[PDB]
């Protein structure tokens, strides 16, 4: 998230909150786009397929520390 999106591992580890609770990405959402263009990016990833539903799934298969490079 921190090199492909333009984001700060700050965020990041946020949307892991999300993944690992089952929780709303909505809160997410503010903390994500408080960067700036790192949140929006992001959002345009999976926007349709929500990206609740989208970081939920991949991150289950993905694997956390590796989210935090990504």
């Not at 965020?11 to 960067?35: D, R």
């Not at 790192?38 to 289950?60: F, H, M, P, T």
């Amino acid at each position: 998230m921190a090199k492909e999106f333009g984001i700060p591992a700050a965020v990041a580890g946020t949307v892991l909150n999300v993944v690992e609770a089952g929780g709303w990405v909505t809160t997410i959402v503010s903390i994500l786009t408080a960067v700036g263009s790192g949140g929006l990016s992001l959002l345009a990833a999976a926007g349709r397929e929500s990206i609740k539903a989208y970081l939920k799934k991949e991150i289950k298969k993905k694997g956390k520390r590796a989210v935090i490079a990504w």
